[PDB]
Structure 1
């Protein structure tokens, strides 16, 4: 479950594409807060240029260009997978992309890829645009809803924080051999 706040839309899609093909299955959340490196006007025109690519004879056989950001992250991970072959079709299916943390994956333990994070990658002043804002200007009309929900979720998780320290402080308080062997016996783990 790799959260995508601050992660590069290309570099996360390299770590996650190897995992899917290795056969791990992952869920990506908070997708709108991922960053597509470069100035927004250029990033917006690179997507509003891609959305001009369509089969002249029938735009229905044409490349499908997706506006909601969960799809924008996954179409990228589709290039880095042999989508047409069966071993690829199983892995594209093994990716669940959620724009914003839905109640479906909220309780899941969350990990982040530090290496592909724009903070640790782009130099300060490179100029970065979040796929969520590109999404709104390419044609996403569901932006406010996913922010209202995310606020309400971060609010119930703020009440939970107060509750969570209490349960885990009692656990720690009752520390009454693995602690003195697994990381402490000429092991140092």
Structure 2
């Protein structure tokens, strides 16, 4: 079981790597989902996430896309999008993932893995927003 600290990691690249790990039968625990970054323009990102949230089924709200508003849920859904969610293999792979905000005491005092292929040092300009900021704008718990 590998534990990844998401602080200062690009959301999409972290999600790609974590999904690749999951598809091979490895348990993963992301411990700082609120500190992931998303490059782009703040207004565009916020508008996109608001549109995702307001997506819903007209005939019955109890069936429409339940896109997330929390940071950990956002990271979870981002990773899910990269898995074959419609297959038993993809469902079993997703059942092997846990995402948390901040470091819970349970995972305290344990090795934290980082992904060099997704660190913010790659970016030429740090024009991004945090998943925590996106959640705050959306009105989620954290």
TM-score normalized by the length of structure 1:
0.71
1:32 corresponds in structure 2 to: 34
Unaligned runs of 5+ in 2: none
After TM superposition, give the deviation of residue 105 of structure 1 in Å: 1.6
CA separation in 1, counterparts of 2:120 and 2:45? 15
Aligned to 1:19: 21
Distance 2:46 2:130 in 1: 10
Q: Name the structure 1 match of 2:139.
A: 139
Query: 2:133 and 2:108 mapped to 1: Cα distance?
Result: 23
Partner in structure 1 of residue 47 of structure 2? 45
Residue-by-residue CA offset, 1:120-150 (whole Å, 9 max, x unaligned): 2x2125x100000110110113x4xxxxxxx
When Rg is computed on C-alpha atoms for both structures, the one with the higher figure is 1
Q: 2:129 & 2:58 partners in 1: Cα distance?
A: 31
1:108 — aligned with what? Answer: 110
The aligned counterpart of 1:123 is: 124
State the aligned residue count.
140
Q: Distance in 2 between matches of 1:101 and 1:119?
A: 23
Runs of 4+ in 1 over 2 A off after TM superposition: none
Q: Runs of 5+ in structure 1 lacking a partner?
A: 144-189
What are the equivalent positions in structure 2 for 1:27-176 lying under 5 Å apart? 27-120=29-122, 122-125=123-126, 127-141=127-141, 143=142
